[PDB]
Amino acid sequence: FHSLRYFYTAWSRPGSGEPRFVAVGYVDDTQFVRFDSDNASPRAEPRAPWMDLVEQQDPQYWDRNTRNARDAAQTYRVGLDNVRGYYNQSEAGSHTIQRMYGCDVGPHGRLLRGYDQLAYDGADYIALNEDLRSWTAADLAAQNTRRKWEEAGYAERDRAYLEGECVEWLLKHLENGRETLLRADPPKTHITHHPISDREVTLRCWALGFYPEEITLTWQHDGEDQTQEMELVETRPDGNGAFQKWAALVVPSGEEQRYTCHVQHEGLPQPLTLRW
Amino acid sequence: EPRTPKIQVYSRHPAENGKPNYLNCYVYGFHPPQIEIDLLKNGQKMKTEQSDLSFSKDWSFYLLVHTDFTPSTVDEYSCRVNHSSLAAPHMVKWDRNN
Amino acid sequence: DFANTFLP
């Protein structure tokens, strides 16, 4: 399946200026949009190639999304003071509101899940339920928001976007961005070798330039899986729009040939098996 | 209560010398969002570009900071991160094979 | 498009 997701962060800056508001959109693992409220006359801006064509495909796209983000930044600067009062916090400290919303779509452009979720200082605050008719508030302070949103009928407007508009734009981005988004790039894999002592040696299994981010790297010894024994770094961006990961075992010297690295990724034909 | 940034320093492409490359400092898993990230050439600061702030499912932020860089057969590259979860800035050196 | 934003 494919997903369109937006990530909002807003935070107060006591003693330095107004609150800051940053928005980024993503189709799957590719960022296509940003907004930063700290620019003079902040505009929504393209972060992926196919977005430099939306101006001729939808002549109003930038103006209405700019407008939308600017109102969002204004709404949350007030939301920061509302929520701070809910928790009876002073104006001295900085605090953070985050929002994550978007849609998961399977084949034939059909909606799987919609979601809209908010965090305050990094903890769950309020979330739209899977049925998109209702809200879950994480604590008593967030029930202030729940009652407001329920009375005002906001879940229905959220559902309207998530079911109609979120889906339609996922499709448009997928199609207009076919070459970037619909690709699956295999990893480029190799094994390096570092000894530490004479009874032990580090074997590091590398995966470079793959898209999407989803990947599994597994080390086996004689077919028995070494997951509990290995060192996996968290998958990292390569900076060109793909990702890197490595897995490493420390193995008895001389026995290198009894360890295999299994690599699974969505655009490999078959899971690969590598040795040194 | 702040969340401490994890920090990876690496090169986009497997490093050979004479090749101008891209040095990445990827810092992730942290909170609150205010943070400072620089790359340093032999201890002295560089000029880089920084990704747009985003966050993961657990609400922790991640940033990528990157610049053009040319390796040497010996020369020293590091990334300095300051965050409220740290008593002072941390500096992590870019090494050969990680 | 961005969704609408609702006031906490």
Residue numbers in the entry:
A (entry chain A): 2 to 277
B (entry chain B): 1 to 98
C (entry chain C): 1 to 8
Question: Would you copy out the relevant sentences from the publication that reported this structure?
Answer:
Major histocompatibility complex (MHC) class I molecules (MHC I) present antigen peptides to the surface of antigen presenting cells (APCs) to active T cells through interaction with T-cell receptors (TCRs), which play pivotal roles in antiviral defense. In this study, we screened bat MHC I Ptal-N*01:01–binding peptides from different bat-borne viruses (HeV, EBOV, MERS-CoV, and H17N10) and determined the structures of bat MHC class I complexed with these viral peptides. The overall structures of Ptal-N*01:01 display the common characteristics of classical MHC I molecules in other mammals, with the extracellular region of the heavy chain folding into three different domains. The α1 and α2 domains construct a typical PBG that contains two α1-helices and eight β-sheets, and the α3 domain and β2m display typical immunoglobulin (Ig) domains and underpin the peptide binding domain.
To verify the uncommon peptide presentation features of bat MHC I, we determined the crystal structures of Ptal-N*01:01 in complex with the two HeV-derived peptides, HeV1 (DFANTFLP) and HeV2 (DYINTNVLP), two EBOV-derived peptides, EBOV-NP1 (DFQESADSFL) and EBOV-NP2 (DFQESADSFLL), one H17N10-derived peptide, H17N10-NP (DFEKEGYSL), and one MERS-CoV-derived peptide, MERS-CoV-S3 (DFTCSQISP). The all-atoms superimposition of Ptal-N*01:01/HeV1 onto the other five structures demonstrates a similar overall conformation, with root mean square deviations (RMSDs) of 0.344–0.517 Å. The superimposition of Ptal-N*01:01/HeV1 onto human MHC I HLA-A2 and mouse MHC I H-2Kd generated RMSDs of 1.198 and 1.119 Å, respectively. The most distinct differences between Ptal-N*01:01 and the MHC I from other vertebrates are located in the N terminus of the PBG, with an extension of the α1-helix in Ptal-N*01:01. Although having different lengths, the 8-mer peptide HeV1, 9-mers HeV2 and H17N10-NP, 10-mer EBOV-NP1, and 11-mer EBOV-NP2 in the PBG of Ptal-N*01:01 all display an M-shaped conformation, with P2 and PΩ residues as the primary anchors and the P5 or P6 residue as the secondary middle anchors. The P1 Asp of all of the peptides adopts a rigid conformation upward to the α1-helix of the heavy chain. Detailed analysis indicated that Asp59, Arg65, and the P1-Asp of the peptides in all six structures of Ptal-N*01:01 form a triangular network of hydrogen bonds. Substitution of Ala at P1 (HeV2-D1A), P2 (HeV2-Y2A), and P9 (HeV2-P9A) of peptide HeV2 led to nearly no refolding for Ptal-N*01:01, whereas Ala at P1 (HeV1-D1A), P2 (HeV1-F2A), and P8 (HeV1-P8A) of peptide HeV1 still supported refolding but with significantly lower stability than the original peptide. In contrast, substitution of Ala at P5 of HeV1 (HeV1-T5A) and at P6 of HeV2 (HeV1-N6A) led to similar yield of refolded heterotrimers, indicating a similar stability compared with the original peptides.
